[PDB]
């Protein structure tokens, strides 16, 4: 995600918003103020942010300067948001424009709040930090520890139920459904949860528990209890999970094939 | 569902009312505003999806009108909703009155907030459609995409984390439970979605993926990852799921259950 | 848990609060309403739950009133709370402060709720109890329904999709995760709920169904759906799920390894 | 105001609506869901005053269809509201649009406002009357008791700190400013306000108490303090008021002439 | 006030409560929150009071606290309020309940809000005092400085428009109509604001301006603007003011005779 | 007001601040948010106009835009608040810091709002301006028309009815409190209300009408009535008003004395 790429995506979020202007005039205002009169997605991110986290305790307004703050310290959280919005429009087929995520899917602003909350712990604002955690759960139904690390091109469709905790990491270019914990095991510190490299596809319902890890390229079929290492390029499925076959694909998270015999 | 029955409905609707209301001071206004002064279960309906969608992008108010507007062209939606409410209080122990599930339960907001946006789909708002589905998803917990064709006498208990997708068929009178997905595979459009015929219950938990058949009467196991169609009358469990048994009715949604032996 | 201890669980919750002030200005005015105000823990606990619990049908200063005349009649669930805080900050590695469990996690607050609405239940007070069961469904993401006899010593880790069903009983000390279903079988009405006893731990994604007993000590693997009887000290997992060994502890509800194996 | 006229009325305000839409992309939304949508003033009409005089006590959607159900029993008043924009935008030189009072300004507001309450206090509807009066006078800051006799072709302009008591009575054709008061005197019921008959002009901050005529136009000046009747077609002025000439036009109300010499 | 008859005003106000239920079922859960569910009128003004005054800075439930408090400690701004209720009833025609103040007039709120700011000024805490002198005069529209001395038995009928400042005094028994000043003169600190003694009535529009008396049982005439001292039992008119009669009655704040003739 | 005078004013506001959140502990938060987070006036008055013009129809974080917008184009705007901030602290000795008129007196907010709503008037942005108009006037109860042209140095004490129409004219170091109305005549647009010159102050309820001069350190009397053009250094006062002296200051705007005989 270059600069020059980061300015097409805002340009092509635009361009889309001046045909929803004219498609919904119930919603004509809402994509003004969301899209049409920002002239950066870092933005249009703060703006978006800033409303659906707010709430009595905390209001939008206060939120959008905390949040502009982090962006302004690292510019970089943008352009990973920036590919989570291309990740989401190439790996889902119900979604057809950039904007759409940005504007709508509950799934990519838990993941642009996550990445507020873990710049503010590494940051020592563990408390407020812990806060937006809690709110995002609530408000989003995806509940991510802020010193999970994650990275950018993730797609989190639907995303109800998804829990990641605290030792959780998460490479670039993961796909992950709707009610998937990565998730800890036992009551010390430590390292304790999955570390899920790049490529991996993980399906819906799939707990994956412990400090274990799952290879680069790997596919985790839906509904599946994964207790062991699934080694890179491998699709691992079922209660509990062994080794099936392997995908067809390098990058399983790019085409999104949710079959398990292989 | 024809138009007699439906006034029954909504007599017995109001005979309840009055009773909760003379039961419960503090809910008697809610009770009167929501129920006692409506004279059909149309008006009460818009009244009820109109203050739970409501958001500031969008007012109570005029939601409402949309719902007016949408039950005034296609009059049959607040019929299958009363067939929706007759399915929860026939299916579901927990609910011994036809007012239950309009007043307070989430799938049942959910399934005709879907209704809403189906239509708004099919006259070409799309973008409003697409604005709907997700406020339902942060607001019930349930993702429905618009474009489902989705039947009547459908109770979807509990429902948090139910996901049904864009090219998902879901025939008259069938049951499902929290946490399915009526799920996609692959990265491209067109039909892969399940299609659920008439008379299938699905226990919480299933993962039912792609444009595979589930057929009439099949009964689905809660936490079953069901990837190949299976035929009428079956019984499917497993992670992968395979058919283990035939259910004891014809209908499984009608009679509830959950056992999988068959 | 005595009052004495229960003091000292309320002197640790305001000490934290008086740092937590100092650290993060802009929650300060916050942790000051509803931790350092207060003189006991049943008081932080009524305003969490009234501002929590606040809608449009009923605002937080009514519901306060409701929880206090709860709280005033049966002194003993100020007391549960106590010990669903500490078995949080016992259990859960990502929880080292008692006051963490009442500011910010929503299977505490769904808890402590359903508490409310079970005394409300057991009063006649039914409707009020319904009401509120699914509004902490839609709010929390966690249905409980208010007949359910839930003990104390309780964590609902993450917690959602939590559903517990009319008849279900939780004695003391069980640790569940999210997507725990303890849920029902058939249309009638009647016992159909899981028995869980003392010590059993449930990890994510478990559904277990019918009246069936799972017996103290005992543990469920995480995605497992039970559907015999499970016995004291003994580990099921699968789905659907078996017996496959034994817990290294007495309860395993304290320690939350989640293998199973043994 | 006939039902030919009232539709032209209504066709400016809409066509005044479609430029306003286009030209402040903003309330591009709050046109079309106020003006655009509606089919007639009556619906228009709903929607402002629900929306305007919502509370936590009552929210719009309810306070709609009891402005809906008093316009379907007495239509006169719509026909009184398209009168009452008239008089607005042909006597006030702020205003060049019809929509303008409908849209914006609260006297206008709180003078339909008065309708219903009269309307419900007639009916037998006190209690809900005195509510909406005293919410009228937070929200607007314009006092009228809804056992008030108010006719059509009203301006209130400005309005801030009108009080109109119990027995007053202002026929059609009259303009009113700013911190006027038609007040009782005494302590006991039945007439004790003024009568203000047709055609009657009511300068800024004027105060005319007790049971006291005031004829038809008859002009009263700013600041005045009428105690005593007013014949037709004079001007009154002074505290305490003196008769201190007679206005240029036989309605003054009309040509807002606000000098007083005569 | 004493403690016997206090019992009565609120036995008053309930019975009244039960009869405005069965009256108005659009408010009956509005009764029983506000009214019927406290057991005395300290209860029911805390309530009041924190709905009314809420804001997003400060929560009704936050408010409820800092005025409960007050009232501990000083329990005779109760008794005051309870005289100030009676005086509205006695005095005002258009309220013959006792409920009637307590739930709708704003300048009996503002009043008792002015009690509480007043009692947190002399506590040191001024910065609050002042946040909710503000907050009133927004709200209500009435602007009472925190340092004003206020009696008992006050009438401010309609309101709108009151302003009180820093030094002023307002003995027991004294009836005040919207939109009168008792002002300041100068830029300097110190004496400068009305004294107004028991008994005296004061006209809509009346300006008193600087540190002068306006004597027992003194009439103000309503638009005048009193520059000098109005000896006891002397009627005020004019702008500026001369005496111009004396009233017919001892206490002219009993009858509320608004003619000045005398 | 220069660069360094602007930097000195905000330096007071923030060290006021600091002690403002050490006294208040429920307000920490807000003094944190409104004053300590921001580096200058303008920033913090964008925040407190931004929160204060929210609504449904314009929430906080849009509203914001639109005033740092116009701030960015014309800098004045926050020296002109900041000389404003000073008329109030010098001028009204309820006042005691520069805090005060930020974080609380309407009177102030609205005159900030007004010139937001006439720079947007000036650009052609005149419906949102008129919005803006109104809203002010229903929130603040202040009611200026956009096109009004109003200097800075300006006191709007109490505020409460202050009425200012469409060609009037208000110079530099002016005072004026609640009730005054600025107003106009006839019904024809054009020129028509008050040229109020510098140095004038204008006492309580004071209307003037029609346009005509009120000439440089006039005073106009509380209560009074103007229909004839002032002088420069001179008094008028009566209903209507004449001249009566000569002021005793040569900007009576700056000293406040009410006193007119002299």
Redesign the interface.
Do not use: W
């Given at each position: 995600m270059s600069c020059e790429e980061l300015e097409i995506v805002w340009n092509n979020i635009k361009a889309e918003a001046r045909t929803?202007?004219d498609?919904?005039?119930?919603?004509?205002?809402?994509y003004?103020?969301t899209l049409?009169?920002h002239e950066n997605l870092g933005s249009a991110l703060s703006?978006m942010l800033?409303?659906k986290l707010s709430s009595?305790?905390?209001?939008?307004?206060?939120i959008?300067?905390?949040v502009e703050e982090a962006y302004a310290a690292d510019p970089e959280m943008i352009a990973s948001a920036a590919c989570d919005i291309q990740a989401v429009r190439?790996?889902?087929?119900?979604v057809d424009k950039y904007s759409?995520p940005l504007?709508?899917?509950?799934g990519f602003h838990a993941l642009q709040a996550y990445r507020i909350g873990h710049w503010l712990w590494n940051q020592g604002?563990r408390?407020?930090a812990?806060?937006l955690?809690?709110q995002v759960?609530?408000?989003?139904?995806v509940?991510i520890?802020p010193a999970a690390k994650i990275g950018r091109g993730i797609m989190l469709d639907?995303a109800?139920?998804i829990?990641v905790?605290?030792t959780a990491v998460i490479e670039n270019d993961v796909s992950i459904?709707?009610?998937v914990?990565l998730?800890?095991?036992?009551?010390?510190?430590?390292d304790?949860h999955p570390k899920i490299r790049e490529g991996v596809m993980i399906?819906?319902?799939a707990?994956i528990?412990?400090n274990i890890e799952v290879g680069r390229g790997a596919k985790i079929?839906?509904?599946?209890?994964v207790?062991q290492p699934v080694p890179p390029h491998t699709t691992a499925?079922?209660?509990?999970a062994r080794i099936v076959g392997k995908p067809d694909s390098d990058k399983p998270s790019?085409?999104?094939?949710?079959?398990?015999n292989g």
């Open positions: 929803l202007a498609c919904e005039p119930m919603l004509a205002s809402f003004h103020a049409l009169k703006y800033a409303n009595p305790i905390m209001p939008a307004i206060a959008r300067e905390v190439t790996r889902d087929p119900a759409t504007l709508y899917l509950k604002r408390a407020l812990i806060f955690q809690n759960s609530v408000t989003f139904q509940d520890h639907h109800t139920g829990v905790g605290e459904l709707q009610s914990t998730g800890g095991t036992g009551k010390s510190g430590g304790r399906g819906a319902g707990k528990l412990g079929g839906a509904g599946s209890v207790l499925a079922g209660v509990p790019m085409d999104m094939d949710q079959h398990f």
